[PDB]
C-alpha cells in the first residue's frame, strides 16, 4: 500500500474510481443522485477543482498499480459557502439541493472562520476506498496523511463533513472534535415524509475539526 500525491495524468483514473465506488455514500444513497459506473458530471466538476488545489492524496495497490482509495482536500475560504448557496439557486436539480443545501446550511450555520479566527480551512471533502480494498484501515491512513499535508502547507484548522460514521470513527481516532451534530431524520418534506431516509448505522451527520501546526 503506497501513499503519494495525485499527478494531473491520473485525474480520470480517480473519476472512474469515484464513479465505481463513491455512490454508496450514506447521504447520496438516502436521496439517490449518482450510481455505479455511470458518470455524475454535476459533482465530478467540483471534484476536478478540489483536485486542482493539489493537496489531495491517493493510495495505489503496491503490486497491481490499481487506484485503491483517495482523500480529496480543498482550501475553503470566507464567503465560499454563501457563493455556493447563491449558485445553488440557479441549479434546478431537487436531489442536489437536498444534499448540498444541508451541507452548506449546516456549515454556514457555524462560522468556523470566526470561531477559530482563520481565513482558509483545510477540508477533507471526499474520502473513497474501493469496494474490494475496503476495511483494511486505508481511510484511517488517508485521513492521517491528509492532516499532515495540512501542517506542511501551514494550515491551522482541518474540517470534514463526516456523513459516514466510519468517517466519524477515523476522525474520532485522530482526535477531531464534533462542531455540529445533526440527525438525518429531523428533515421532513411538505407531507411529513423523511427527506434523508438513511439506512443505519448512519443516523446523523457530524462536522468535525482538529487544530494543527
Ligand X SMILES: CC(=O)SCCNC(=O)CCNC(=O)[C@H](O)C(C)(C)COP(=O)(O)OP(=O)(O)OC[C@H]1O[C@@H](n2cnc3c(N)ncnc32)[C@H](O)[C@@H]1OP(=O)(O)O
Annotated binding site: 127, 135, 137, 139-140, 163-164, 166, 173
Largest CA distance in the chain: 53
Residues making up the chain, counted from first to last: 213
- Residue 176 burial by Cβ neighbours in a 10 Å radius (0-12, 13-18, 19+): buried
Least Å distance, CB 80 to ligand X, is 16
- β partners of residue 78: none
Judged by beta carbon, residue 140 or residue 192, the one nearer ligand X is 140
> Please, what is the minimum distance in Å from the beta carbon of residue 117 to ligand X?
26
Position of minimal CB gap to ligand X: 139
On whether the CB atoms of residues 133 and 61 are closer than 8 A, the answer is yes
Give contact residues for ligand X (rule: CB under 6 A): 25, 27-28, 99, 126-129, 134-140, 161, 163-164, 166-167, 169-170, 173
Minimum distance between the CB of residue 96 and ligand X, rounded to whole angstroms?
Answer: 10
Closest distance between ligand X and the C-beta of residue 28, in Å? 4
Q: Which is nearer to ligand X, 114 or 184 (CB)?
A: 184
Binding site members for acetyl-CoA: 127, 135, 137, 139-140, 163-164, 166, 173
CB of 135 to ligand X, least distance (A): 5
Kindly compute the dihedral angle of the four CA atoms of residues 208, 53, 68, 11, in this order, to the nearest 10 degrees: 150
C-alpha–C-alpha distance, residues 42 and 81, integer Å: 17
Decide whether 36 or 192 has the Cβ nearer to ligand X: 36
Q: Which is nearer to ligand X, 81 or 170 (CB)?
A: 170
Of 175 and 192, nearer to ligand X (C-beta) is 175
Using alpha carbons only, give the angle 6, 8, 14 rounded to the nearest 5 degrees: 60
Taking the C-alpha atoms of residue 210 and residue 42, their distance in angstroms, rounded to an integer, is 30
Amino acid at each position: 500500500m503506497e501513499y503519494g500525491p495525485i499527478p494531473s495524468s491520473k485525474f480520470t483514473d480517480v473519476i472512474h474510481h469515484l464513479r465505481h465506488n463513491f455512490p454508496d455514500e450514506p447521504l447520496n444513497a438516502s436521496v439517490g443522485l449518482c450510481v455505479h459506473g455511470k458518470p455524475c458530471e454535476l459533482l465530478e466538476h467540483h471534484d476536478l477543482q478540489t483536485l486542482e488545489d493539489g493537496l489531495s492524496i491517493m493510495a495505489v495497490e503496491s503490486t497491481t498499480g490499481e487506484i485503491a482509495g483517495v482523500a480529496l482536500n480543498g482550501i475553503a475560504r470566507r464567503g465560499d459557502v454563501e457563493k455556493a448557496l447563491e449558485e445553488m439557486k440557479s441549479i434546478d436539480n431537487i436531489k442536489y439541493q437536498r444534499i448540498f443545501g444541508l451541507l452548506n446550511n449546516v456549515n454556514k450555520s457555524i462560522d468556523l472562520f470566526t470561531k477559530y479566527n482563520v481565513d482558509k480551512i483545510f477540508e477533507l471533502r471526499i474520502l473513497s476506498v474501493d469496494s474490494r480494498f475496503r476495511g483494511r484501515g486505508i481511510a484511517k491512513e488517508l485521513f492521517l496523511r491528509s492532516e499532515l499535508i495540512a501542517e506542511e502547507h501551514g494550515f491551522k484548522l482541518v474540517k470534514v463533513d463526516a456523513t459516514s460514521l466510519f468517517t466519524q470513527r477515523a476522525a474520532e481516532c485522530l482526535g477531531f472534535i464534533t462542531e455540529k451534530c445533526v440527525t438525518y431524520g429531523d428533515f421532513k418534506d411538505e407531507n411529513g415524509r423523511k427527506i434523508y431516509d438513511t439506512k443505519s448505522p448512519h443516523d446523523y451527520y457530524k462536522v468535525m475539526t482538529k487544530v494543527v501546526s
